[PDB]
Symmetry: D2
């Protein structure tokens, strides 16, 4: 079946009640049928329900469907997109190791990687997605992951995935792609050799600014890269937390297994059932929604691009954009999602715009059905240094927009009056 169909059917066979909609398991524990069954589950001998901090049936449906839509093998939902980025990195790197990360990513993920992970003895090494030789340069035998975004936030920078893959495969390093903005419907990183995909479900999957959540998805056959690979000992050595169990002995997606038995179990960034359920509902309609977000974004982009009071527009469909060729190369449906940014005349103009819009809501989020607006320098990328901003391509006049599902003429009119004030 096609992706649209897989977001609606699969990973749910109807329990006894045969409800068409997936039930909401607002529950933490399960009744084991007998003591053997219980103990067997605690020993990984038998798979099954144990305790919601580890897994929940509502969230399991979500995980598998997300994996199905991406063309991957297994997916794991967590409390948030950040938790997903965090879990993906620590599942690969531990104290004394380093990770390579793109210089054009979400501000929060940047802070997590370049500052917060130090506390755990994990070194971060920045690289430029626009000049991949810079990636080869920071790689050593201690580099455990290569992290980047498919379509960056807020520069809307597109990564040349095939080239990142080449380098990653060569050194036998796990590649992590945050495909949040593009969504699995506009881009399928797995098709291009990506090992692990992370998503902030909180954005487009929800599509309505109502459910915070994240997911870690692994490709098919990822064990091939982790098993018997000197770069990843955690997956090839007896583990004392599990009475000597060695993950390379399992015929299961070991990356996902470790996320469950270790990170969810001990760190506990668990996705609540109600959020999981809402996210499932959003997943069902994402295919239709992302197209509208895209169509609207393009019109807004064309309008901003021709207006005299605007000094520059950042959106991949624009033929003059630096990522336009990469866009045509990797986006099969010719839709570029709903995020875009533009340059106002100056700081004072950017501020007047944010204070004058009536439909674009001044807020810090993206992928909501309602259009949103923000000024990154003093907000989302407020933590970054004055120079890091320039490396990511942001200025004091920069405005970021999250294009919603409203009528395009109404949106254009709202931006027009704000801009012209």
């Amino acid at each position: 079946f096609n992706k649209e169909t897989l977001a609606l059917h699969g990973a749910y066979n109807f329990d006894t009640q045969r409800s068409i909609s997936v039930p909401i398991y607002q529950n933490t524990a399960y009744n084991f049928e007998n003591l053997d069954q219980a103990a067997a589950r605690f020993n990984l001998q038998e798979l099954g329900n144990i305790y919601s901090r580890l897994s929940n049936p509502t969230s399991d449906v979500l995980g598998q469907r997300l994996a199905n839509v991406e063309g991957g093998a297994f997916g794991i939902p967590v409390a948030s997109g950040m938790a997903a980025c965090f879990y993906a990195l620590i599942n690969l790197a531990s104290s004394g190791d380093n990770v390579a990360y793109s210089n054009k990513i979400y501000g929060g993920t940047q802070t997590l990687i370049s500052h917060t992970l130090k506390n755990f003895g994990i070194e971060a090494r920045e690289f430029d997605i626009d000049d991949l030789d810079s990636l080869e340069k920071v790689i050593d035998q201690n580099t455990k992951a290569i992290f980047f975004e498919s379509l960056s936030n807020p520069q809307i920078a597109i990564a040349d995935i095939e080239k990142i893959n080449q380098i990653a495969k060569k050194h036998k390093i796990v590649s992590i792609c945050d495909n949040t903005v593009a969504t699995p419907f506009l881009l399928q990183p797995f098709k291009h050799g990506v090992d692990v995909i992370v998503h902030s479900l909180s954005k487009y999957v929800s599509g309505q600014g109502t459910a915070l959540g994240g997911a870690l998805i692994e490709r098919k056959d990822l064990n091939d890269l982790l098993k018997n690979n000197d770069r990843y000992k955690a997956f090839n050595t007896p583990d004392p937390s599990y009475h000597g169990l060695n993950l390379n002995t399992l015929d299961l997606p070991i990356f996902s297994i470790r996320v469950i038995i270790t990170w969810l179990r001990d760190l506990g960034a668990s996705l609540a059932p109600q959020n999981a359920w809402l996210l499932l509902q959003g997943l069902e309609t994402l295919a239709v929604r992302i197209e509208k977000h895209s169509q609207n974004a393009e019109k807004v982009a064309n309008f901003l691009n021709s207006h005299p009071d605007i000094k520059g527009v950042n959106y991949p469909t624009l033929a003059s954009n630096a990522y336009h060729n990469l866009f045509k190369k990797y986006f099969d449906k010719n839709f570029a999602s709903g995020l875009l940014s533009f340059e106002a005349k100056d700081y004072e103009h950017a501020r007047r715009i944010c204070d004058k819009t009536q439909l674009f809501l001044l807020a810090a989020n993206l992928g909501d059905s309602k259009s949103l607006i923000i000024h990154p320098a003093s907000t989302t990328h407020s933590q970054l240094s004055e120079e890091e901003l320039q490396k990511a391509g942001i200025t004091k006049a920069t405005i970021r927009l999250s294009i919603g599902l409203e009528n395009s003429d109404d949106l254009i009119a709202d931006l027009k009056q704000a801009i012209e004030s």
Copy 2:
């Protein structure tokens, strides 16, 4: 002003425009800033307020403050789970190269987190015996950033002599962390005895119905006094690059909680969902009445087990022969000891028949549910522990742990009776 029961029902909520008596469920991730200054000001910690739900949410804020109010603390922060709360409390104090001291009698999951999982982040764990505090002095050095223990342990039901832990902790200027999950704030108030930070698995008694996973970190009043200008905690006294040189010791705010928000929630994201937060608020409202029934039932079940010939030992603090009975009388003002207890069956085979025979006690892995629960720890909750660590925590192959629910005690006793006698 008011009593605890009252504070679990009123407070930290003004009634918005609609004046709904119940706290609204903010199933929402973002907020509409009134203007650009306001926004930027919030991102700079100049003005406090709503920004994004991964950091804070109004539904969960009411929960945090009320939990703090019932404990007699200053500020509280709900997180996705009890484990997340334990994790966040430790990392907010220790970083790579440091060590933490922890009780040998705690929740299995927390034990794994501390003794194994934290190694991955370069955080050393040093076990100590709550029954012999000299063992605590012994493992302390200038790199020790936290002293962790449970007020009423899971599953031994071991009571910590809080005042003595406090003495040692205050002497070395170390932050003490107490997991008060089982006792609940209604049976015991660790802050009264010098505890600095309290963690709770809200998932257990606060929920009281096995429906909402959640955790909370609560800090005492004046905790800044201990963190500010203390060489043992540089993260709270040095310009932070993640925040353009901001130095937390400069703030007139609960800095422990602030760091949890601006750093751990913001970057690690173990955020508590709004629906769970709301359900937990509801549970908090009734915890005072519920915990008393749980306690009354537990005591009757304990007395019954204690007199039955097929039972070899019972662990519950109300029993006069119990080793923690004096500590119980010393720290528990309402003479209720909560709903968790454990007992020894004749042997492994007997413990297993019991688990397979009960009809009301549900074989499951959780505690504090309104429905009674049962489990065999060695092969389950403490399955990860070594054969010797089990003995240091006091668990055997014949050990059974029970979570006493709100059902009728005669019905519960009868269910255990038939299971035990077969």
Copy 3:
């Protein structure tokens, strides 16, 4: 088998495939029939089962059966609200041209429903005094299809002498309906005293937290005996065209509840949403412990008000001087009288100051919330104040009322 407290926690739920201890929330409207026969069979009442949530939902089914179990009845049906429950109970018995007898001491909304709104449907209402039952005999005729009253009235806190109502009802072969909302199934069991149908506003004590609007209709065991072959109830003994001639008296099922489903829920649609049903199930689990606190607190507040010089009269059954005290001792086995009470202030102006001065008692229109509530509502006067006693600390409550009263 088990006690009430236990039945509110175990029963009517056997764990699906996932074996979740908590009942799942079926936020769902339709079900996947396994095959066409199964489907058609369900639409014909040949096979019982899931069809569409407007009729029934598994989450709400657990609630219905447990409520029935705690009351000692046979089957229960949850609906959108207590009002809907009262409405559905009456219309399931009376149709245009019939009449219903109702107590003069009941919930205002129910009084309006019965004495005014039902006229629109050609249903006559005939009031009777619960304190003088001869008045009931008087209004009864062969067209009287129901006798409605409250076990513990709102806001009078008037207790009905159930046995005597039952006698009269059983004699004439008329279905008796008891609204047991305030007393709750834990303080009083109307079925023990001959009641046929029990209605509850689940919105009040079952929820116990002012969060879920809901109602329920519960029928006693063997109610068919009274409905089948009874000339007073032709709807249950005549082929029905809406169901291809089906005659309910032919069914080995609780026909009263069946009609509520296949007709009133199906066509009028006052369905109880799954989130509400689930919350109500949660509340049901803890009602036994909660109602005792509500009761203990109410009694202390009552005693305090009863001794304060600025208060002119207190209405609560535990007070030995109260007119319903003997009826209280006769029907309430635990010695708890719930959390509703009323009292007389010095006068209208005093009653207002009180409502405007309380800090814990919240000025609002509801009852049975965990938070204490207050309001200024024929059995009532301009000085009358009604209180809904919450779960707060009694000393705190008393202190809040003391400062309001003394201002």
Copy 4:
């Protein structure tokens, strides 16, 4: 001002103190009045505002007003279900001894409600043929209080010639009620054609995912003009004892909606729960994009069925040979006909094999779910499909294998 798509996303919501972009879920039954006067004033209809959730709730209020906004109406009231909405609309107009005129081509449940269940309340029902409007003139008398029909019928997919119904209704000064559930406010706007009251089963397309049962009654702008001083509707022109003699014709408010609240919701209690209302609001936000996919998919499935040799007849308005095609072109401005359609199998046994063989079309009784559905309700060979949001090729393939074997 704005377009419909925009109105489904913005409006009727202020941002309370917290300024949450999403509408909060008021899982609550009561409200804290600020003082005694305020309270009493609300119980007397002097001041509008929150009282008790059985009557109104802020979450559901946003839904009501937005639904009204998208339809181009004045006020909307959500209720527990579509049936409850139909019921409430009728009884708000007719009482014992009156009669109502209803279309012979409507939802089965509504047909039962009107032709059988309402008898219990002394309300007579008189059927009429939407395809032959003279039949409507015929059943009308001075006791006829409502004219009920569907814009796009279920399961016939029969389109009503609204203008002609309106003509007749306006002439006799009778309130017209249009169930616009299947078409949705995005494909058809009955108010544009003189309809007085619109009912919707929100449970279907507005939810769009089979998760929230709900209904709504929406009234047009200026409906008072038709109700006030109209001898046909005394309930809206006589002192009411339930409200201490209050006479509704004295109010500067949508009196039709007011009565639904102060009388039907208050006393009958078919209240819409907050969680359902909130979910429905979420569905409303995305209905515009969803209904187009449902429509595009339906059309393709219809064309496929229409050309397959094992299929004997297809019922969908976009098909040029369909009897309602001209009416479709006349009333549907976008050229989308929603996701409901029906077709004739070879015979009863074939219709049954199909229902038992589909893997994507789920054998169930509902419509407007994002997942495609199928059922056997008109003839013995008739099959009714609810076209979902799945990929059309996948849907066509599933039906192809079922039909062919």
